[PDB]
Design a protein around this ligand. Structure first.
Ligand SMILES: Nc1ncnc2c1ncn2[C@@H]1O[C@H](COP(=O)(O)OP(=O)(O)O)[C@@H](O)[C@H]1O
Ligand SMILES: Nc1ncnc2c1ncn2[C@@H]1O[C@H](COP(=O)(O)OP(=O)(O)O)[C@@H](O)[C@H]1O
Ligand SMILES: [Mg+2]
Ligand SMILES: [Mg+2]
Lengths: 143, 143
């Protein structure tokens, strides 16, 4: 039941100074950060990561925003982590995000929506391998 | 005035699930995390890092604790960062730690005091260069 999923705090999250608050949201929910790395993505990295949206019309802006500032890359671990993550994140459009979700509480607009999360276990594996070596991920007990 | 200093959330901080809470402490006090990386230190790394304490009787234990589990390495940037960081951390001995400090709130004992902070600017340069390439540190504008 324990899975690992990718979480990324987008540039607006760091600029709003809410890195800690966001991380706490996961921790309080049982989503254990087992890998964390603040990094400034290059255009090549963002494009390759979001390649699935190349045919889409906002892709170019998505890429620019994703490289406008540094982000915080994280791997969350827990039971049904992929889904749990999507739940706490909330809807893509902050306006439609549920109460208490990261996006409803911190997101500005649909373009600047503070966080990213793997949409599936399949994509989680890919996204995690894109940004982390297995040797960079470390689980630990909660006690 | 504006300085950069090294902060490390020791193994017990992650086990207590308070990474977010600790980071928020800094963010709200004006200490901006410009570099972050969760890592499991090796014996060689912990020893080399705490070289100044090589002749102290607690050295061997400090090293063992520091490699018992992963830690979160961070570089904080802000006004009088070196001193500011330490004030927020609190006294080495949790018993003597002031109200509202990280150690009084989260530390359990002196040999498991949750956080590390560079003790001086000269040492901050050394400690930061020990764990981070200049290319891994990224400042960004706030709100
Ligand atoms: N219909 C849309 N119109 C405009 N921008 C969108 C739309 N759908 C998605 N996006 C933007 O592209 C980003 C990436 O999409 P997605 O692949 O769903 O990842 P994510 O986890 O980052 O939300 C979204 O977070 C959002 O900013
Ligand atoms: N007298 C002591 N007895 C036991 N452990 C100690 C003692 N002094 C320091 N240490 C340990 O080694 C670390 C050394 O750091 P130090 O430079 O003494 O101050 P700090 O509290 O700012 O980290 C401490 O945080 C603590 O874990
Ligand atoms: Mg999608
Ligand atoms: Mg010290």
């Amino acid at each position: 039941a324990i899975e690992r999923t990718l979480s990324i705090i987008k540039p607006d999250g760091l600029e709003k100074g809410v890195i800690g608050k966001i991380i706490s949201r996961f921790e309080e929910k049982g989503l254990k950060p087992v890998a964390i790395r603040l990094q400034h993505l290059s255009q090549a990295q963002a494009e390759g990561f979001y390649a699935v949206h190349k045919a889409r019309p906002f892709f170019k802006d998505l890429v620019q925003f994703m490289i406008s500032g540094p982000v915080v890359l994280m791997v969350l671990e827990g039971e049904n982590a992929v889904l749990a993550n999507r739940d706490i994140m909330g809807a893509t459009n902050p306006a439609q995000a549920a109460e208490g979700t990261i996006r409803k509480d911190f997101a500005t607009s649909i373009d600047k929506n503070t966080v990213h999360g793997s949409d599936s276990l399949e994509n989680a594996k890919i996204e995690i391998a894109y940004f982390f070596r297995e040797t960079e991920i470390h689980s630990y007990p909660y006690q």
